[PDB]
Amino acid sequence: EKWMEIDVLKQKVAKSSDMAFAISSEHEKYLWTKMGCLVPIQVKWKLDKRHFNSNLSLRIRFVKYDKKENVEYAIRNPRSDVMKCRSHTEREQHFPFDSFFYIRNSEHEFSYSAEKGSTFTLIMYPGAVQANFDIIFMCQEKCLDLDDRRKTMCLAVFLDDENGNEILHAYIKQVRIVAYPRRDWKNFCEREDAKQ
Ligand SMILES: [Zn+2]
Numbered sequence: 386e387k388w389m390e391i392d393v394l395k396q397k398v399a400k401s402s403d404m405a406f407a408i409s410s411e412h413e414k415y416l417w418t419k420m421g422c423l424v425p426i427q428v429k430w431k432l433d434k435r436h437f438n439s440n441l442s443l444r445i446r447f448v449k450y451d452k453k454e455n456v457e458y459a460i461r462n463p464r465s466d467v468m469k470c471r472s473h474t475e476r477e478q479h480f481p482f483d484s485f486f487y488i489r490n491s492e493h494e495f496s497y498s499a500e501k502g503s504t505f506t507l508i509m510y511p512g513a514v515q516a517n518f519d520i521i522f523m524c525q526e527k528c529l530d531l532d533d534r535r536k537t538m539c540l541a542v543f544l545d546d547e548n549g550n551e552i553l554h555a556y557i558k559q560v561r562i563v564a565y566p567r568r569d570w571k572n573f574c575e576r577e578d579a580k581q
Pocket of ligand 1: 469523
């Protein structure tokens, strides 16, 4: 009927020193990347009958969650944004300066608002079934307070109809912004594959 997926552009990510992507044994998606690096994202979807000719928009959020507040709740909670640290905020030269992340090389027109949480909204057109763009993180795990460092950061996207109703969603279950993405990615893969 209808589905949506978010993934990194594998071709480029495949052997990059700056980022790495993997799937868990449970098929959830994991991304590790350095801050200040362009991560190539591709959002794809298939729509049902009633939306075939709909004008749609795509919302992009970057939130945190833990065992106490699950992913489905967190991604739609306007108060769950991952917060940029003080020093990266004031040192920021991309507007809005306090956003943890930015969208570049977007094939689609986009706008930004923090009203209901830091969100980039891609304006699309009837018939669009994919959205390509780079996302770049301007703060990192190392910057956060121990309690926040323990929470999981999540990149979530929502496909909305003309009336603003979410009709599909997808996310990268865990995103980590670290110094050596290949170290963490490798440890993750070995631990997963060890699982008989
Ligand atoms: Zn920072």
